[PDB]
Write a protein that binds this ligand. Structure first.
Ligand SMILES: *[C@@H]1O[C@H](CO)[C@@H](O[C@@H]2O[C@H](CO)[C@@H](O)[C@H](O)[C@H]2NC(C)=O)[C@H](O)[C@H]1NC(C)=O
Ligand SMILES: *[C@@H]1O[C@H](CO)[C@@H](O[C@@H]2O[C@H](CO)[C@@H](O)[C@H](O)[C@H]2NC(C)=O)[C@H](O)[C@H]1NC(C)=O
Ligand SMILES: *[C@@H]1O[C@H](CO)[C@@H](O[C@@H]2O[C@H](CO)[C@@H](O)[C@H](O)[C@H]2NC(C)=O)[C@H](O)[C@H]1NC(C)=O
Ligand SMILES: *[C@@H]1O[C@H](CO)[C@@H](O[C@@H]2O[C@H](CO)[C@@H](O)[C@H](O)[C@H]2NC(C)=O)[C@H](O)[C@H]1NC(C)=O
Ligand SMILES: *[C@@H]1O[C@H](CO)[C@@H](O[C@@H]2O[C@H](CO)[C@@H](O)[C@H](O)[C@H]2NC(C)=O)[C@H](O)[C@H]1NC(C)=O
Ligand SMILES: *[C@@H]1O[C@H](CO)[C@@H](O[C@@H]2O[C@H](CO)[C@@H](O)[C@H](O)[C@H]2NC(C)=O)[C@H](O)[C@H]1NC(C)=O
Ligand SMILES: *[C@@H]1O[C@H](CO)[C@@H](O[C@@H]2O[C@H](CO)[C@@H](O)[C@H](O)[C@H]2NC(C)=O)[C@H](O)[C@H]1NC(C)=O
Ligand SMILES: *[C@@H]1O[C@H](CO)[C@@H](O[C@@H]2O[C@H](CO)[C@@H](O)[C@H](O)[C@H]2NC(C)=O)[C@H](O)[C@H]1NC(C)=O
Ligand SMILES: *[C@@H]1O[C@H](CO)[C@@H](O[C@@H]2O[C@H](CO)[C@@H](O)[C@H](O)[C@H]2NC(C)=O)[C@H](O)[C@H]1NC(C)=O
Ligand SMILES: *[C@@H]1O[C@H](CO)[C@@H](O[C@@H]2O[C@H](CO)[C@@H](O)[C@H](O)[C@H]2NC(C)=O)[C@H](O)[C@H]1NC(C)=O
Ligand SMILES: *[C@@H]1O[C@H](CO)[C@@H](O)[C@H](O)[C@H]1NC(C)=O
Ligand SMILES: *[C@@H]1O[C@H](CO)[C@@H](O)[C@H](O)[C@H]1NC(C)=O
Ligand SMILES: *[C@@H]1O[C@H](CO)[C@@H](O)[C@H](O)[C@H]1NC(C)=O
Ligand SMILES: *[C@@H]1O[C@H](CO)[C@@H](O)[C@H](O)[C@H]1NC(C)=O
Ligand SMILES: *[C@@H]1O[C@H](CO)[C@@H](O)[C@H](O)[C@H]1NC(C)=O
Lengths: 334, 328, 334, 335, 325
């Protein structure tokens, strides 16, 4: 019979999945995992979940699937169905849906007993997505692979590659998209909330930052244009109907702009972005100034002049704060 | 042969899944259970369901999976596939969808026959959600685990931990989110719809309250500002065009505010919050005042409508104080 | 050996599923059934479907799963996996999707052979859902259970309980919700698609009615407010500018109310509700009234009689609307 | 042992599913099929797919599942699990989802070897749903059942009932709905992806037509009402601000009408409905007439009067064409 | 026993799925594949996923499933369940969902050992869609098939048909739809995630373009009508009520046009559609009303409007030109 067929028979007719493959039960099975991010398919700041398509590969030593290549025509490694052998139950804690990814029927066995398992994960995980810096926003999400049942005495987890490689690896990442990732940071720890159970878990912090240009052109530049134009409402003659008409029309322009803002901004219930805070503050200041003009026009002057200067100074202060905040947010993002 | 392999063969060679594991059929199988809420993924007040991600673990005594460690290299406990042993039919009654949780292949067996089963559940359950206090909600609805088929003299349920410990347990809860849970309250009862049969069930009341600050900033403060502006608007005489122009400005503000609210205020079919009632009442008063001004430009109507407006704002104000008081 | 273990072996090592469990093939298997409605999750008038959560239980006599208790330590009842025995193919015809229900691994067996099977069903079924009486809706559609393949000479269906007990059963219904059920009505008939075969089917009519209060407050009362406002307005002089102003302002308000209704009224294409038709009619009648004043004021005996005719016609329409509301409530209350 | 049990053991003990049940491999397996449409659950003119709940039943001769009734207590037929026997891979083309139908565990076997398989299919398939005639629209969507792998040398398809009996079959159709079906027309043909292989397929053309009354009431009557109001508006003099205000309010009525209609007028990208074209052309005519009126007001006249009458005539002609196209669409929809 | 039954018995009694079917393990298994696009079911730019329903067929030589026809009643070909034999793990990369593909129980075997597997794939894949030219879009989305686990030393991929034939093949495409595909371009390369290992993969570039006529009728012509009317309205004086009435007329026109737009115009965060910005810009500019200063700001505004419309026209011509060729 051919080498592959009789080798597979030799291995799997004696093998019995369902028992951790160690001939000394005190020895833990060390699962060396690795993660390569392929694409951040989706990021719901509304639902506080994100969908990451990651190529996940892990290997472990199976002490029963060993053979001498000299007896089997120099076969160094062979592929066998994944469901035919014991597979560690490594699982990611913050999953929200098991995922719609395929099964990848096969795994590789090397004559040393090492089992290599490559599988794609279209995992969607709960995440603390915060849009406080909306346009210049950097999200720091994490994935935590942990042996769900087995304690560290049974299954331990480690990195396949050196940490420096996995941090900087962006070989196959789909760069085009709303998000670009700066790196995935591994971190090992012995999770434990129990009297005598310590579970090994491997955290990967996937750092991703939004690329703002579309939002810069859509929100920031028009908002800056409107805020700059609003300064002119304070150089037109103080109580003229011309000035009141100007302020009314620019308030209408701001109001219609905020509709586009509502359309464009991502929905959330955790916290409003600073951009929205400044927009609504400017709207309130403009309304107050317009009301002051309306009232003073009803009356009329000295009070009007001093109030006008006060409102102009507060408006200038607000717009300066907004611009400095934009610069600061950009500095944080880069 | 290695101890693990021959121990597994010894246990499972003659084992027969599908029979309740007791050597005296009169004894009930007591399934001790525990629940830890990991995250409240979604609360939907239109579909009246909420999705919670919970770490559910349970253990029971399987009287056939027993061995002396002396014969098996002092193997005190081992893991074997979950599908290879009898597993109790504990089910959550008010589930709406089975969920998308994984299968968790293995379970632990201790040499005394105790089987420990840990499994994550993304349960989606029906609940009597109400948004009467929308920004200051405190929802309170149950998860009840019961043996679906087996009566109490076949399967019985109990708590793994003391009730107070599970009640105060928030070790792993994912805090950052719209909902924070005040506690889960266990409660045991013998359900029955026909006297010949009694069923053991264990209710867990997950108590969660919305953290309002986002809606305080986004909804309450702009509405308060607009109400204050409309109140000040009445200092202009009705016979003055300034008043109608100012009213138009505030109606434009309310249009913008309503559009923003549409993106945020929850939809439902059972009833809107008091906040919505006050919103529409204030908008109606503003519109009626605009009609009054455009009609004038009956003078006592000015101060009458102003008093109604002042009354509404005060009612709106004390409602917020009351709702906040309940929220604490 | 323990009693349960050897009893289960004795039964299921000889037993073979697939074959209908009857030792005389000329005898049909009578499958008693029962249904308890747990909740009405979703009634969709756009898709013309509704989703109900029902606790469905059925029992039948299996003539091979019988034993003498004396031989098995007086075991008079035991549980065995549902997939280890013949399970009748009782299926629901109106189904549109099987649903998200679990599988309930086990069933009960009594020593005389009767098998008890309990299973929850998330049935979603096609139904003719008309909203003609929208606020005071009462719906009438049904669920029919029938052996999909087997004729009545193989499988016949029957009620577990007396018809009046299932009819009045509201022991577990989730009452808090948009819909309340008035009862479930069983009805047995021998369906026959082709003259050579007869099939047993058991129709359950799940009668439900909407609880209107939210829609009564949200739609009906504001609508009547607007309509009575128009009636009040008709008191103004015919050619007066006040009359035209009132008409046009009420047009704006009523149109925005129609927009609100569109936002709130359920979507459908099978048919418009009466409430909707009267709204549209009265709007059109108002537009005719408004259009009329433009000609008359532009150009008064003709105006006066024309105004009187319009006023009386609109008042008659208002009365018809109110009487329609009384009729709809009278039907829904009983 | 009981007759059923030993008969089942006699049949299925040595039965080897997977192999086509024919004892002379050269003979094809003729799979007779039938289809009864139960309900047209959803026609999606946006996505150009529809979902039809159809009761599908097929039978074929299995040469190995044969027995002599006298030897087994005179049993003429029995039911056995569907997964225990060879089942032809008759598959519908142009599907978009495998469907949400159950598994129907059992099939009937008759002693001659005929296997009967009844199964409900929640098929969702692609057809070119052209809504040109939207309110009075008749769609001719098709289902084709074909042995996905096996060529005609292995599996051949045929009708269970006479073609006219299936063409006029509405025995169990759920008629209360937006769509009513005029019939399903069978048509056999031998497809050939490459001339070396010939594939037998059975096309059923399900013909369905929208019942318009809802759309009549909600769209066409209000549209006629607004158009008649616009025709009335032309009586007012062009020089009058009354006419300008009337036209502005009528245009606002147009706007609100279309706003509400957006909920019900189907979305699509294959082509605009004819009624939509008339809507937009009347809207544009109204707008341009109003603009000309405003300009002539600015001037304020002979040319003004001539253009007023000309625009009135064009509007009247457009309304006449609208009536003609409505009656035409209705005439086609009747047949 | 009948020929088919005992032939299946001979083949499958000692056959054991799992082992790559070669009697000399050093030989790679060459999986010839072919792909025919049947329909482009969806192009979702908001999620950047494209859904195509494609007829996928592949064949390979299984060196264990061989027989002499003379011994088995001259049977040259037979069908056996797909689950009963080794099947290569040819996986399409950049999938998003495994998809609603049916199981297709059977495959053909020919006495020389060739296995033919036909299966329909409803692949939904993530690829870079863009609506920069919305009404005149042309998209270039890839499908790449690769043996997920096996390296090129185990599984190698090739085309069933000649590249030009598969490229120009549009025999079964559902042509009556929003999208028409120009062709599918195959391309073979040895992917390498590590220096020591090489993976064979086969990219098919599906090239599709939106057919615009609907959007020309629905969007472009009405928008040009409204823009031309806005230009015309400038001749009414800047202080006059005639201009106000004209502006309200135009505003109602835009009110209808924008709901029509919202019902059809796609939106995504990757970038803007050049056509889309003008609509909202012009609708917003009705706010503008910019006596000595006003009368000349009006001419400035008129120049702005005219240049905007000129840019719109040349943009439409450009978009059509890049879409035609
Ligand atoms: C579980 O695995 C971790 C990771 O491999 C082990 O931690 C390493 O221990 C070695 C000891 O020589 C150190 O050199 C490494 O620096 C450690 N790595 C990290 C990330 O801390 C851990 O010792 C293992 N524990 C058990 C019980 O097997
Ligand atoms: C994302 O979060 C991770 C984890 O908190 C940060 O990584 C830590 O950074 C600090 C400061 O440089 C170090 O002292 C820790 O050792 C890091 N942890 C690990 C596991 O490497 C990371 O800096 C954050 N990045 C961003 C952009 O927020
Ligand atoms: C089923 O389980 C319940 C819950 O543990 C048992 O109820 C307890 O019984 C013990 C008996 O010693 C009491 O001390 C506890 O106070 C009971 N707890 C509660 C919450 O009632 C019950 O006895 C078990 N058996 C049966 C037949 O119900
Ligand atoms: C949530 O609902 C539960 C169930 O009604 C409440 O728990 C009960 O509260 C009452 C009043 O304090 C006690 O008498 C009962 O003993 C409690 N039952 C249990 C099982 O603990 C709970 O107080 C509610 N919480 C909120 C915040 O509404
Ligand atoms: C729902 O439909 C059922 C079936 O038509 C109605 O029940 C029938 O009502 C008629 C008239 O009262 C009786 O003669 C039948 O005997 C009833 N059938 C059964 C099985 O009881 C029922 O009335 C409908 N619901 C409503 C609210 O009208
Ligand atoms: C199938 O089952 C139904 C329901 O049990 C049978 O109908 C009953 O027939 C008996 C005959 O005496 C009547 O007394 C009952 O009132 C009937 N019940 C109902 C609900 O109508 C029916 O006879 C059975 N048919 C066969 C062929 O066995
Ligand atoms: C495959 O089946 C079709 C349909 O039954 C066969 O076509 C019919 O064959 C009969 C007998 O020759 C003719 O009377 C009919 O006119 C044919 N057409 C139809 C529509 O019935 C066809 O011959 C079969 N082919 C094979 C190879 O079995
Ligand atoms: C739907 O399409 C079918 C298939 O083209 C039409 O049926 C054909 O009609 C022509 C009319 O000349 C006949 O010559 C063919 O013989 C018919 N074929 C079949 C299989 O019956 C049908 O008329 C169309 N119906 C509608 C309403 O469009
Ligand atoms: C794997 O398959 C590819 C084809 O997909 C082989 O490449 C071909 O090799 C032949 C050798 O004569 C050339 O004529 C073709 O031009 C090649 N095609 C391409 C697309 O490069 C390749 O040799 C096979 N084996 C390996 C190890 O890659
Ligand atoms: C779609 O992308 C493919 C791949 O880049 C293009 O096809 C290649 O184009 C280059 C440049 O003209 C040629 O050198 C190659 O021979 C082409 N084929 C392959 C397989 O690379 C194709 O032109 C693109 N189509 C569109 C419309 O952008
Ligand atoms: C394995 O291959 C080497 C040459 O590469 C050969 O010398 C050796 O004999 C082979 N093994 C056996 C068992 O023949
Ligand atoms: C098992 O444990 C007992 C108690 O500690 C000890 O005496 C014995 O030597 C152990 N046996 C083995 C094989 O470890
Ligand atoms: C079974 O129950 C009967 C009473 O019904 C009793 O007499 C008998 O002893 C019991 N048998 C056993 C083995 O307990
Ligand atoms: C077998 O059944 C047929 C049909 O019912 C009947 O005519 C025949 O007499 C029966 N024969 C025997 C031996 O039962
Ligand atoms: C077997 O079939 C082939 C098909 O071409 C034919 O040429 C050959 O003569 C046949 N041989 C026998 C023995 O039937």
């Amino acid at each position: 019979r051919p080498a592959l067929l009789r080798l597979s028979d030799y291995l799997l007719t004696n093998y019995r999945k369902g028992v951790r493959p160690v001939r000394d039960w005190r020895k833990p099975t060390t699962v060396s995992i690795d993660v390569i991010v392929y694409a951040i398919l989706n990021v719901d700041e509304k639902n506080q979940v994100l969908t990451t398509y990651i190529w996940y590969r892990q290997y472990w030593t199976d002490e029963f699937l060993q053979w001498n290549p000299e007896d089997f025509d120099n076969i160094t490694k062979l592929s066998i169905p994944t469901d035919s052998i014991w597979v560690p139950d490594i699982l990611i804690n913050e999953f929200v849906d098991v995922g719609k990814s395929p099964n990848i029927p096969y795994v590789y066995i090397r004559h040393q007993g090492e089992v290599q398992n490559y599988k794609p994960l279209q995992v969607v995980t709960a995440c603390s997505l915060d849009i406080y810096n909306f346009p210049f926003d950097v999200q720091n999400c994490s994935l935590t692979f942990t042996s769900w049942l087995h304690t560290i005495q049974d299954i331990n987890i480690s990195l396949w590659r050196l940490p420096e490689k996995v941090k900087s690896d962006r070989s196959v990442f789909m760069n085009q998209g709303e998000w670009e990732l700066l790196g995935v940071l591994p971190y090992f720890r012995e999770f434990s909330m129990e009297s005598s159970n310590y579970y090994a878990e491997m955290k990967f912090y996937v750092v991703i930052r939004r690329r703002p240009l579309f939002y810069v052109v859509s929100l920031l530049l028009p908002s800056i244009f409107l805020m700059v134009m609003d300064i002119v409402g304070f150089y037109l003659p103080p109580n003229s109907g011309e000035r009141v008409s100007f302020k009314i029309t620019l308030l209408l322009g701001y109001s219609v702009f905020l509709i586009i803002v509502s359309d464009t901004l991502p929905a959330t219930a955790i916290g409003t972005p600073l951009i929205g805070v400044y927009f609504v503050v400017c709207m309130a200041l403009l309304v107050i100034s317009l009301a002051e003009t309306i009232f003073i026009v009803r009356l009329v002057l000295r009070v009007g002049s001093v109030l006008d200067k006060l409102l102009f100074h507060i408006y200038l202060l607000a717009v300066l704060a907004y611009s400095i905040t934009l610069v600061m947010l950009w500095s944080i993002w880069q």
